[PDB]
Ligand SMILES: CO[C@@H]1O[C@H](CO)[C@@H](O)[C@@H](O[C@H]2O[C@H](CO)[C@@H](O)[C@H](O)[C@@H]2O)[C@@H]1O
Ligand SMILES: CO[C@@H]1O[C@H](CO)[C@@H](O)[C@@H](O[C@H]2O[C@H](CO)[C@@H](O)[C@H](O)[C@@H]2O)[C@@H]1O
Ligand SMILES: CO[C@@H]1O[C@H](CO)[C@@H](O)[C@H](O[C@H]2O[C@H](CO)[C@@H](O)[C@H](O)[C@@H]2O)[C@@H]1O
């Protein structure tokens with residue numbers, strides 16, 4: 001199984017697998033059942049911003065999701081990622097729908113990773129516009145880019161309607177060096193803006209920023225509550 | 235009173251005012267009496283690196299100090315800086331000597347702050363060399379710069395010989411908008427490299443990175459254990 | 469006199485002082501009389517973006533001004549700024565109105581300066597919103613800060629309408645070390661977004677990004693065609 | 703064949719193929735025969751820095767190569783890369799040896815590409831230490847990674863001796879979006895530090911930073927004067 005650290009923006013409460021009964025942001029460490037969640041007021045059809053921060057000094061994985069009206073939800077979990085993640089990973093964005101659905105539209109994604117020692121190795125990318133053939137993104141499942149400049153992680157119908165039982169992921173093409181024993185600080189941060197729209201009656205299932213082994217694939221069956229991240233709900 | 239937030243590399247244990255009984259790094263919140271410390275093996279005549287990171291989402295100010303052999307000390311303190319600093323600040327470096335002395339040489343200093351809302355105000359500077367006329371630094375007390383390219387926070391001689399009763403600070407010329415009520419993320423980091431050397435009976439007193447009100451001055455009598463930071467040891 | 473290097477977005481053809489007979493972008497080297505210009509179609513009440521780029525290696529100061537439709541104007545000038553500017557400078561934005569007028573609104577402004585080596589000193593700042601008390605800007609003449617979150621280089625009424633005979637500049641608070649004789653690469657770029665609106669018979673006079681001596685102030689009578697920049701039109 | 707834009711640090715004058723009769727830095731556009739060269743004083747066994755700058759405003763490809771004593775050589779060629787390079791590329795470093803040889807040691811390599819506005823897509827990577835298994839570099843031919851934390855583009859023998867008839871290249875793993883039609887500015891810059899040592903008399907053949915089609919590979923026979931870049935000397 002892939003190893004997954006994710007920040008989930010979870011729109012649909014799966015209380016049978018330990019979701020709280022509200023939409024929530026969560027920190028997931030090798031389980032879809034978040035280690036820490038904060039209640040999240042998903043603003044339907046508004047553009048949200050998620051920021052994700054981690055460094056190896058504080059070892060606190062933090063996320064905020066905010067919308068321009070000012071509503072933000074924040075979650076943090078102290079976790080030593082040296083002990084969770086492979087040294088080398090791919091970073092990505094993941095989303096899913098199951099019985100219920102939503103557009104899981106990414107409008108921008110930025111990532112910076114650094115390994116500082118005494119004084120740096122670093123990777124930074126930013127996408128504000130996704131291109132039709134976006135050669136530095138590995139698109140998995142139903143994930144599609146361009147020409148509107150967005151990344152549609154999951155299926156949107158011609159008529160604009162999001163489709164259920166969809167999953168897709170974008171991963172940055174290059175492997176990322178997320179920790180290195182000799183580094184005194186390893187840090188990463190990620191930001192993405194997203195547009196979750198549910199016309200129908202209930203948004204599902206959510207969007208995750210995730211970090212995984214290099215060869216990470218969509219686990220078979222990982223539509224719906226599994227967010228394209230996990231093979232099961234353990 | 236000035237309002238002070240600081241990461242001290244405290245080379246001298248003033249156990250009468252609450253220092254631990256060893257050299258230490260410490261996180262100073264409006265008091266010289268650190269809210270958290272970690273034992274710090276200061277490596278005499280070696281070039282050390284301090285990295286300070288504050289994570290507005292995680293609300294955690296962290297610092298590591300390391301030397302090239304790999305030895306590091308780490309300290310984090312859980313704090314919301316919105317509740318501490320004013321909105322506008324100066325950032326700087328401070329050092330002092332007292333009855334015991336050391337060089338407090340800064341070889342480099344970088345700083346980044348970001349104030350985000352949705353889809354940012356930022357400031358970033360980096361010094362890798364300090365000119366004799368370093369116009370974007372407010373030198374206070376005994377801080378000089380140049381010509382060896384270094385910033386000397388406290389008096390040192392001609393031939394490298396540290397002086398007692400010395401207090402010096404360098405603040406960045408521009409004010410920094412370090413938080414704002416409407417910032418989703420108000421982060422900063424800073425990195426400095428330093429050379430503390432002493433042939434004394436004991437080194438004293440330390441270097442601090444600090445954030446203060448804009449009009450912040452060296453408090454009267456803040457040589458020694460007060461680190462050029464604080465008016466008294468409360 | 470001050471020493472001035474500027475990129476002007478000059479909305480008003482002052483053909484008696486060497487402007488071309490159309491709105492234009494220009495590169496001003498110690499003179500309001502551009503060393504090079506390109507015809508610029510200023511789009512009234514649209515948000516335009518100016519990007520300024522200099523490197524010490526190519527010795528070429530380049531500017532583009534665009535608007536969201538794709539319409540751009542470009543100017544480059546071959547010049548060694550080591551030969552023109554003092555080592556230390558302030559960078560800023562300037563605008564003026566004269567007998568004719570326009571809003572000279574700045575919606576964002578960034579700047580990055582790097583001096584290597586042979587490590588790197590750098591300054592970067594980023595304004596995407598301007599505060600009512602924007603402490604890290606020196607406002608001169610009729611420059612306000614906002615809300616509307618904006619920087620109003622010249623007097624406009626709270627109810628949008630620009631004023632004649634107005635001059636205003638914003639300089640970043642810190643001096644910038646823009647070149648140094650022992651720098652291998654002394655480069656900078658700036659970008660600003662702006663909104664020029666006029667209901668006048670023409671718009672005038674324009675906006676400039678400028679680099680000046682540290683103690684640079686608006687020269688007496690540099691409203692109008694002088695762009696707040698120059699004491700005369702030589 | 704592959705399409706190549708390169709900046710060459712050419713240590714060995716190949717006068718039968720239009721090299722000047724001195725070591726030189728050169729700008730190569732789709733030919734090993736540089737469009738523009740500058741005499742370069744290669745300082746044997748010293749750590750050099752090459753900086754390479756391009757933006758699509760000035761359209762000036764510039765490069766400096768410097769050593770810490772302060773000697774630098776600069777070369778620039780106005781060239782419109784939109785008409786040379788495919789939209790998506792890989793960027794890399796290349797070196798070769800032929801009859802004569804030198805170590806072609808890379809101690810650091812950084813790269814930034816940006817596509818602004820009209821907002822930003824950007825890639826930035828920074829390598830100060832190369833790792834034995836550097837998963838974000840595509841190593842071709844004889845390029846190893848250490849440790850020592852260095853990239854050896856071409857073969858160095860056990861006894862330190864650089865070998866002749868070596869060629870190797872490192873390319874960054876991710877494709878880079880070097881130009882995009884709707885972008886207002888497409889810029890890149892690259893820097894790398896290198897240590898060219900010739901035990902044997904007699905340095906050859908050089909080091910290039912190059913930009914290539916994504917699937918670019920070492921042309922057969924591109925040891926020696928072809929720098930791992932070109933199939934022939936046309
Ligand atoms: C010899 O140790 C000293 O004890 C003195 C007698 O109590 C006292 O004055 C102390 O302080 C001076 O020196 C230290 C180290 O430089 C400073 O931390 C103090 O502020 C003071 O300047 C010292 O413990
Ligand atoms: C009617 O247009 C004007 O002609 C006037 C005739 O002398 C003269 O005052 C001009 O200048 C004022 O207005 C322009 C545009 O605002 C400025 O460029 C000048 O410096 C001056 O303030 C104008 O051509
Ligand atoms: C109406 O709520 C649902 O009950 C269904 C019957 O058991 C169940 O299948 C459904 O789960 C599906 O949809 C969820 C919301 O999209 C998703 O998280 C699941 O993985 C699954 O697709 C939900 O429990």
Ligand SMILES: CO[C@@H]1O[C@H](CO)[C@@H](O)[C@H](O[C@H]2O[C@H](CO)[C@@H](O)[C@H](O)[C@@H]2O)[C@@H]1O
Nearest residue numbers: 714716799800801802803906907925926927
């Ligand atoms: C002594 O000079 C050499 O003359 C040789 C005659 O055959 C020739 O092979 C040699 O070129 C080879 O080495 C160069 C230096 O490394 C290299 O640029 C060539 O590609 C080739 O390997 C040089 O001309």
Ligand SMILES: [Ca+2]
Nearest residue numbers: 010012013014
């Ligand atoms: Ca769920």
Ligand SMILES: [Ca+2]
Nearest residue numbers: 244246247248
């Ligand atoms: Ca102390």
Ligand SMILES: [Ca+2]
Nearest residue numbers: 478480481482
């Ligand atoms: Ca004019």
Ligand SMILES: [Ca+2]
Nearest residue numbers: 712714715716
């Ligand atoms: Ca050659």
Ligand SMILES: [Mn+2]
Nearest residue numbers: 010019026034
């Ligand atoms: Mn959940």
Ligand SMILES: [Mn+2]
Nearest residue numbers: 244253260268
């Ligand atoms: Mn202490």
Ligand SMILES: [Mn+2]
Nearest residue numbers: 478487494502
């Ligand atoms: Mn003009």
Ligand SMILES: [Mn+2]
Nearest residue numbers: 712721728736
């Ligand atoms: Mn050549």
